Coordinates of C-alpha atoms (C1' of nucleotides) and ligand atoms in Angstrom, one line a residue:
Chain A
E1 CA 0.0 0.0 0.0
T2 CA 3.1 2.2 -0.1
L3 CA 4.6 4.5 -2.8
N4 CA 6.6 1.4 -4.0
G5 CA 3.9 0.4 -6.5
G6 CA 6.0 0.3 -9.7
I7 CA 8.5 -2.1 -8.2
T8 CA 5.8 -4.5 -6.9
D9 CA 3.9 -4.2 -10.2
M10 CA 6.7 -5.7 -12.3
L11 CA 7.3 -8.2 -9.5
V12 CA 3.7 -9.4 -9.7
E13 CA 3.7 -9.6 -13.5
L14 CA 6.9 -11.5 -13.4
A15 CA 5.2 -14.2 -11.4
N16 CA 2.0 -14.2 -13.4
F17 CA 4.4 -15.4 -16.1
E18 CA 6.2 -18.2 -14.1
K19 CA 2.7 -19.4 -13.2
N20 CA 1.1 -19.2 -16.7
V21 CA 4.0 -19.8 -19.0
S22 CA 6.8 -21.4 -17.0
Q23 CA 6.8 -24.6 -15.2
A24 CA 7.6 -23.0 -11.9
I25 CA 5.3 -22.5 -9.0
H26 CA 8.2 -21.8 -6.5
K27 CA 9.5 -19.0 -8.7
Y28 CA 5.8 -17.9 -8.7
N29 CA 5.8 -17.9 -4.9
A30 CA 9.2 -16.3 -4.5
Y31 CA 8.2 -13.4 -6.8
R32 CA 4.8 -13.0 -5.0
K33 CA 6.1 -13.0 -1.4
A34 CA 8.7 -10.5 -2.5
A35 CA 5.9 -8.3 -3.8
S36 CA 4.3 -8.7 -0.4
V37 CA 7.4 -7.7 1.6
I38 CA 8.0 -4.6 -0.5
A39 CA 4.3 -3.6 -0.2
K40 CA 4.2 -3.4 3.6
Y41 CA 7.6 -1.6 3.6
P42 CA 7.4 1.9 5.3
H43 CA 10.1 3.6 3.1
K44 CA 10.6 4.4 -0.6
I45 CA 13.2 2.1 -2.1
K46 CA 16.1 3.6 -4.0
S47 CA 18.5 0.7 -4.0
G48 CA 18.5 -3.0 -4.9
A49 CA 20.4 -3.9 -1.8
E50 CA 18.0 -2.0 0.3
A51 CA 15.1 -4.2 -0.7
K52 CA 17.4 -7.2 -0.2
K53 CA 17.7 -6.6 3.5
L54 CA 14.1 -7.9 3.6
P55 CA 13.4 -11.6 3.9
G56 CA 12.2 -13.0 0.6
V57 CA 14.1 -10.6 -1.6
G58 CA 17.5 -12.2 -2.6
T59 CA 20.3 -12.0 -5.1
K60 CA 18.6 -12.5 -8.5
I61 CA 15.3 -11.0 -7.4
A62 CA 17.2 -7.9 -6.2
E63 CA 19.5 -7.6 -9.2
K64 CA 16.4 -7.1 -11.3
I65 CA 15.2 -4.3 -9.0
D66 CA 18.4 -2.5 -9.6
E67 CA 17.5 -2.5 -13.4
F68 CA 14.0 -1.1 -12.7
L69 CA 15.4 1.7 -10.6
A70 CA 18.3 2.3 -13.0
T71 CA 16.9 2.1 -16.5
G72 CA 13.2 2.5 -17.1
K73 CA 11.8 -1.0 -16.6
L74 CA 13.1 -4.6 -17.2
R75 CA 14.3 -6.3 -20.4
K76 CA 12.9 -9.7 -19.4
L77 CA 9.3 -8.4 -19.0
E78 CA 9.6 -6.9 -22.5
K79 CA 10.6 -10.1 -24.3
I80 CA 7.6 -11.6 -22.5
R81 CA 5.0 -8.9 -23.2
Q82 CA 6.1 -9.1 -26.9
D83 CA 5.9 -12.9 -27.2
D84 CA 3.0 -14.5 -29.1
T85 CA 3.0 -17.7 -27.0
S86 CA 3.0 -16.0 -23.6
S87 CA 0.3 -13.5 -24.5
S88 CA -1.9 -16.4 -25.8
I89 CA -1.4 -18.7 -22.8
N90 CA -2.5 -15.7 -20.7
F91 CA -5.5 -15.2 -22.9
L92 CA -6.6 -18.8 -22.7
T93 CA -6.2 -18.9 -19.0
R94 CA -9.1 -16.4 -18.9
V95 CA -11.8 -19.1 -19.6
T96 CA -12.9 -20.9 -16.5
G97 CA -11.9 -24.5 -16.6
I98 CA -8.7 -23.7 -18.5
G99 CA -5.5 -22.8 -16.7
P100 CA -1.8 -23.1 -17.2
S101 CA -1.5 -26.8 -18.2
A102 CA -4.3 -26.9 -20.7
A103 CA -3.5 -23.5 -22.2
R104 CA 0.1 -24.6 -22.7
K105 CA -1.2 -27.7 -24.4
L106 CA -3.6 -25.7 -26.6
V107 CA -1.1 -23.0 -27.6
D108 CA 1.3 -25.8 -28.4
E109 CA -1.3 -26.9 -31.0
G110 CA -1.8 -23.5 -32.5
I111 CA -5.0 -22.8 -30.5
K112 CA -4.9 -19.3 -29.2
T113 CA -8.2 -17.5 -29.3
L114 CA -12.0 -17.8 -28.9
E115 CA -12.5 -18.4 -32.6
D116 CA -9.6 -20.9 -32.4
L117 CA -11.4 -22.6 -29.4
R118 CA -15.0 -22.7 -30.9
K119 CA -13.6 -24.6 -33.8
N120 CA -12.0 -26.9 -31.3
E121 CA -14.4 -27.8 -28.6
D122 CA -13.4 -31.5 -29.0
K123 CA -10.2 -30.7 -27.1
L124 CA -12.0 -29.2 -24.2
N125 CA -13.6 -31.0 -21.2
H126 CA -17.1 -30.0 -20.1
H127 CA -16.1 -27.4 -17.6
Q128 CA -14.0 -25.5 -20.2
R129 CA -16.7 -25.8 -22.8
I130 CA -19.2 -23.8 -20.7
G131 CA -16.5 -21.3 -19.8
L132 CA -16.1 -20.9 -23.5
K133 CA -19.8 -20.7 -24.3
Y134 CA -20.2 -18.0 -21.7
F135 CA -16.8 -16.2 -22.0
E136 CA -18.1 -12.7 -22.6
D137 CA -20.3 -12.2 -19.6
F138 CA -18.3 -14.4 -17.2
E139 CA -15.8 -11.4 -17.4
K140 CA -18.7 -9.0 -16.9
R141 CA -19.6 -8.2 -13.3
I142 CA -23.0 -8.0 -11.5
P143 CA -24.9 -5.0 -10.1
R144 CA -26.7 -5.2 -6.8
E145 CA -30.2 -4.4 -8.1
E146 CA -29.7 -7.5 -10.2
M147 CA -27.8 -9.4 -7.4
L148 CA -30.6 -9.1 -4.9
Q149 CA -33.0 -10.2 -7.6
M150 CA -31.3 -13.6 -7.6
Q151 CA -31.2 -13.8 -3.8
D152 CA -34.9 -13.2 -3.7
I153 CA -35.1 -16.1 -6.1
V154 CA -32.9 -18.5 -4.2
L155 CA -34.3 -17.6 -0.8
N156 CA -37.9 -17.8 -2.1
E157 CA -37.5 -21.1 -4.0
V158 CA -35.4 -22.9 -1.3
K159 CA -38.1 -22.1 1.3
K160 CA -40.9 -23.2 -1.0
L161 CA -39.1 -26.6 -1.2
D162 CA -38.7 -27.2 2.5
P163 CA -38.8 -24.3 5.0
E164 CA -36.0 -25.8 7.1
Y165 CA -33.5 -24.8 4.5
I166 CA -31.4 -21.7 5.2
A167 CA -29.6 -19.9 2.3
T168 CA -27.2 -17.1 3.1
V169 CA -25.6 -15.3 0.2
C170 CA -21.9 -14.7 0.8
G171 CA -18.7 -13.4 -0.8
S172 CA -18.6 -9.7 -2.1
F173 CA -22.3 -9.4 -1.4
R174 CA -22.0 -9.9 2.3
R175 CA -19.0 -7.5 2.2
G176 CA -21.4 -4.9 0.8
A177 CA -19.8 -4.7 -2.6
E178 CA -21.8 -2.7 -5.2
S179 CA -20.7 -5.2 -7.8
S180 CA -20.0 -9.0 -7.6
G181 CA -18.3 -11.5 -9.9
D182 CA -20.3 -14.6 -9.1
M183 CA -23.2 -15.6 -6.8
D184 CA -22.2 -17.4 -3.6
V185 CA -24.7 -19.2 -1.5
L186 CA -24.1 -21.1 1.7
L187 CA -26.8 -23.6 2.3
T188 CA -27.8 -25.0 5.7
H189 CA -30.4 -27.7 6.7
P190 CA -31.2 -29.1 10.2
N191 CA -31.2 -32.7 9.2
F192 CA -27.4 -32.2 8.5
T193 CA -24.9 -31.7 11.3
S194 CA -21.1 -32.5 11.6
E195 CA -21.7 -35.8 13.2
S196 CA -24.2 -37.0 10.5
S197 CA -23.3 -38.7 7.3
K198 CA -23.5 -36.8 3.9
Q199 CA -27.0 -36.1 2.6
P200 CA -25.9 -35.0 -0.9
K201 CA -29.7 -35.0 -1.4
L202 CA -30.2 -31.9 0.6
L203 CA -28.1 -30.0 -1.9
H204 CA -29.1 -31.8 -5.1
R205 CA -32.8 -31.2 -4.4
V206 CA -32.4 -27.3 -4.3
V207 CA -30.3 -27.7 -7.3
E208 CA -32.7 -30.0 -9.3
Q209 CA -35.5 -27.5 -8.3
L210 CA -33.6 -24.4 -9.3
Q211 CA -33.1 -26.1 -12.7
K212 CA -36.9 -26.8 -13.0
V213 CA -37.8 -23.1 -12.6
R214 CA -35.1 -22.5 -15.2
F215 CA -32.8 -20.3 -13.2
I216 CA -29.9 -22.7 -13.3
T217 CA -29.0 -23.5 -16.9
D218 CA -25.7 -25.4 -16.5
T219 CA -23.5 -27.4 -14.2
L220 CA -19.7 -27.3 -13.9
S221 CA -19.4 -29.7 -11.0
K222 CA -21.8 -31.1 -8.4
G223 CA -20.8 -33.2 -5.4
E224 CA -21.7 -34.2 -1.8
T225 CA -20.9 -30.7 -0.3
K226 CA -20.5 -28.4 -3.4
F227 CA -22.3 -27.3 -6.6
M228 CA -20.7 -25.1 -9.2
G229 CA -22.7 -24.0 -12.1
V230 CA -24.4 -21.4 -14.2
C231 CA -27.5 -19.3 -13.4
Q232 CA -29.4 -16.5 -15.3
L233 CA -32.1 -14.1 -14.2
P234 CA -35.5 -14.4 -15.9
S235 CA -35.6 -12.9 -19.4
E236 CA -38.1 -10.1 -18.6
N237 CA -39.9 -11.0 -21.9
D238 CA -37.7 -11.3 -25.0
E239 CA -34.4 -9.9 -26.1
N240 CA -33.3 -7.5 -23.3
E241 CA -32.2 -10.7 -21.6
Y242 CA -29.8 -10.7 -18.7
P243 CA -26.3 -12.3 -19.0
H244 CA -25.4 -15.8 -17.6
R245 CA -23.8 -15.8 -14.2
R246 CA -21.6 -18.2 -12.2
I247 CA -23.1 -19.6 -9.0
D248 CA -21.9 -21.8 -6.2
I249 CA -24.1 -23.5 -3.7
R250 CA -22.2 -24.9 -0.7
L251 CA -23.9 -27.2 1.8
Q252 CA -22.7 -26.5 5.4
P253 CA -23.3 -28.5 8.6
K254 CA -25.8 -26.5 10.7
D255 CA -23.7 -26.6 13.8
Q256 CA -20.6 -25.2 12.0
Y257 CA -22.6 -22.4 10.3
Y258 CA -20.5 -19.6 11.7
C259 CA -17.1 -21.0 10.7
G260 CA -18.5 -21.7 7.2
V261 CA -20.1 -18.2 6.7
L262 CA -16.7 -16.9 7.8
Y263 CA -14.7 -18.8 5.2
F264 CA -17.0 -17.5 2.4
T265 CA -17.3 -13.8 2.9
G266 CA -13.8 -13.2 1.7
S267 CA -11.7 -11.9 0.4
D268 CA -9.5 -14.9 -0.3
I269 CA -6.7 -12.6 0.9
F270 CA -8.5 -11.8 4.2
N271 CA -8.9 -15.6 4.6
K272 CA -5.2 -16.0 4.0
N273 CA -4.2 -13.2 6.4
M274 CA -6.5 -14.4 9.1
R275 CA -5.5 -18.0 8.6
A276 CA -1.8 -17.4 8.6
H277 CA -2.1 -14.8 11.5
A278 CA -3.7 -17.7 13.4
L279 CA -0.9 -20.3 13.1
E280 CA 1.4 -18.0 15.1
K281 CA -1.2 -18.4 17.8
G282 CA -1.1 -22.1 17.2
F283 CA -4.6 -22.5 15.7
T284 CA -5.9 -24.1 12.4
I285 CA -9.0 -22.2 11.2
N286 CA -11.0 -24.2 8.7
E287 CA -14.2 -23.6 6.8
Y288 CA -15.5 -26.0 9.4
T289 CA -13.5 -25.8 12.6
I290 CA -11.0 -23.7 14.6
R291 CA -8.8 -25.9 16.7
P292 CA -5.6 -25.8 18.8
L293 CA -2.4 -26.9 17.0
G294 CA -0.7 -28.8 19.8
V295 CA 2.9 -30.0 20.5
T296 CA 4.1 -31.4 17.2
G297 CA 1.6 -31.0 14.3
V298 CA -1.3 -32.8 16.1
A299 CA -4.4 -30.7 15.7
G300 CA -6.5 -31.0 18.8
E301 CA -10.2 -31.4 19.2
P302 CA -12.2 -28.4 17.7
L303 CA -13.5 -25.4 19.6
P304 CA -16.9 -23.9 20.5
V305 CA -18.2 -21.1 18.3
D306 CA -21.5 -19.2 18.6
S307 CA -20.5 -16.3 16.5
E308 CA -17.7 -15.1 14.1
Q309 CA -16.4 -12.9 16.9
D310 CA -15.4 -16.0 18.8
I311 CA -13.1 -17.2 16.0
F312 CA -11.8 -13.6 16.1
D313 CA -11.2 -13.6 19.8
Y314 CA -9.7 -17.0 19.8
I315 CA -6.7 -16.1 17.8
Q316 CA -6.3 -12.8 19.8
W317 CA -7.5 -10.7 16.8
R318 CA -9.5 -7.5 16.7
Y319 CA -13.0 -7.9 15.2
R320 CA -13.7 -6.7 11.7
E321 CA -17.2 -6.8 10.3
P322 CA -18.1 -7.9 6.8
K323 CA -17.2 -4.7 4.8
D324 CA -13.7 -4.4 6.2
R325 CA -12.6 -7.9 5.2
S326 CA -9.7 -7.6 2.7
Chain B
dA1 C1' -3.1 -41.3 -6.0
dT2 C1' -2.1 -37.6 -8.5
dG3 C1' -2.4 -33.6 -11.2
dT4 C1' -5.3 -29.7 -12.4
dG5 C1' -8.5 -26.4 -11.7
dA6 C1' -11.3 -23.6 -8.7
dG7 C1' -12.2 -21.9 -4.4
Chain C
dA1 C1' -4.6 -21.6 3.9
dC2 C1' -7.1 -25.1 3.1
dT3 C1' -10.8 -27.5 0.8
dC4 C1' -13.6 -29.9 -2.9
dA5 C1' -14.6 -31.8 -7.4
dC6 C1' -12.9 -33.7 -12.0
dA7 C1' -10.3 -36.7 -14.5
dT8 C1' -6.6 -40.2 -14.8
Ligands
LIG1 C1 -10.7 -17.6 -4.5 C2 -10.7 -18.0 -3.1 C3 -11.9 -17.8 -2.4 N1 -12.0 -18.1 -1.1 C4 -13.2 -17.9 -0.4 C5 -13.3 -16.5 0.0 C6 -14.4 -15.9 -0.8 C7 -15.2 -17.1 -1.3 C8 -15.8 -16.9 -2.7 O1 -14.8 -15.9 -3.2 P1 -14.9 -15.2 -4.6 O2 -13.8 -15.8 -5.4 O3 -16.3 -15.3 -5.3 O4 -14.6 -13.7 -4.1 P2 -15.8 -12.6 -4.2 O5 -15.8 -11.9 -2.9 O6 -17.2 -13.1 -4.5 O7 -15.2 -11.6 -5.4 P3 -16.0 -11.3 -6.7 O8 -17.2 -10.4 -6.4 O9 -16.5 -12.6 -7.3 O10 -15.1 -10.6 -7.7 O11 -14.2 -18.1 -1.4 C9 -10.8 -18.7 -0.4 O12 -11.0 -18.9 0.8 N2 -9.7 -18.8 -1.1 C10 -9.6 -18.5 -2.4 O13 -8.5 -18.7 -3.0
LIG2 NA1 -9.4 -20.1 -16.3
LIG3 NA1 -18.2 -14.5 -5.5
LIG4 NA1 -17.1 -18.6 -6.3
LIG5 NA1 -5.1 -21.7 9.7

DNA sequence: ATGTGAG
DNA sequence: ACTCACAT
């Protein structure tokens, strides 16, 4: 969050390459944690060996910083930005279902764009094919006026099915965001607690129903606990049609509701801060259970929770309500 | 079982 | 950080 942006920019882009184009995940981590250290740094960096004093920045990662701070930018990130392969892997990556490995494989075979893909759906698995089919609007985001409209359609249909069901919309929404990427529903039913076995049925029935009233149109994956698929708000009579959205429905044990609604309402970075900044206090927060991390690596028997706050006050952390979670 | 993808 | 689902 400091006036060291440029430095951490090129650092982040340099990893988004080792991820997408190179083999390396460890190079991807090293470059990212380096971005992290420099971001929190109080001062403005004017040397390469000054950033090096930090843990995570080291010889080759600090040589490059000298370049950035000596001559404009970096040569490596120019050969990359001006490569056909790299740019195309990065493009393909943008369909859900495709990431690094498959893009590599596709670009190796001269497949590089939407038109390229549509003529080549044979190569894609089912997930990817729906990501394709709905590429345009999957990158579009969702207004609230329209977001609520779906909530009043999931809350209303899930209750008509069986009034014991509880649906709480999470992610961005709970954080108050004016715009969301994709719909996130945590589902809870009394019949299902942590001690009880499975009940895929409890999920699959609100799914199968949401399909019947034609609000869910596709499925990416559907299991015991989790459904990932595609929704779309009702075409208010012909043509002016709303775009297709992504939607998750997770089925949470009723007794571990609080832990679960914590895990959702992100961000994913807030979940990684809070989780890491717990393992110093020797705890292992889940989406299910907070629990002491004993002597060796043995994770002790859970921990009572009747509110998020309790998780918060377990790990000796200030409380931050859903809207300050990032 | 593992790798991959999404979360 | 830590899980879940898919496809070998
Ligand atoms: C990706 C990811 C997510 N989570 C949790 C935390 C949030 C929920 C849903 O997050 P989402 O990606 O939709 O974020 P959302 O807030 O909905 O952002 P958009 O509005 O979709 O952009 O998942 C996580 O723990 N680790 C992860 O790596
Ligand atoms: Na993708
Ligand atoms: Na979301
Ligand atoms: Na999601
Ligand atoms: Na943790």
